[PDB]
Symmetry: C2
Subunit: 129 residues, 2 copies
């Protein structure tokens, strides 16, 4: 009678309300799944972008390693060429020293010869006739 | 027709009640994934930016090194020219000492003859 009739009215209050909540849940997930997708891709393209820089990093540290190798060779080489120079600058000073010493001996024997032509001369001009 | 509509109410309200727990659960997960990419994007921004800096520092090290080479190379080439110049000079200084030696010797021998012209001639007097 009176309850079974009232229970029918409150039942339809609860369906029209459930149809509001139905449009409401549908829309919340809809707006959040736009977001979860736009974001899943945005992570993909930043995760790849990380790895273009992580390889960029390996390419530079090994570009570097090979510079440091060429430097090591060129350093070791300079050492040796610098030693050849120092040692040739010594032999040089040594030969120029010999030059100077023979020049002095050559000059001493020129003086001596000119003096002994003078003694021969002065000796023989006692016999002169 | 109104005998029916009370059954057609209950089952629109059944199949809608099941779509609730389903959408409620798809909501909680869609959000959960979101929170997880935001968590992990933050962390990636802090990697990517570190690496951008790592590269700019290694390239500045590569440039230091490439410069250190270019100058060692130039310096080795200058040192090789210096070696060549000093050998050629050595040869020249040695040539000169051999000529000064032969001159030293002809004067030694010219003086030697003169000592005997004097000595041959001094005897008599």
């Amino acid at each position: 009678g009176s309850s079974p009739l009232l229970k029918s009215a409150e039942r339809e209050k609860e369906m029209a309300s459930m149809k509001e909540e139905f449009t409401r849940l549908k829309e919340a997930l809809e707006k959040s799944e736009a977001r979860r997708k736009e974001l899943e891709e945005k992570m993909v393209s930043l995760l790849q972008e990380k790895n273009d820089l992580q390889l960029q990093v390996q390419a530079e540290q090994d570009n570097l390693a090979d510079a440091e190798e060429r430097c090591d060779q060129l350093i070791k080489n300079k050492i040796q060429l610098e030693a050849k120079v120092k040692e040739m600058n010594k032999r040089l000073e040594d030969e120029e020293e010999m030059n100077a010493e023979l020049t002095a001996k050559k000059r001493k024997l020129e003086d001596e010869c000119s003096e002994l032509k003078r003694d021969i001369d002065d000796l023989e001009l006692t016999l002169a006739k």
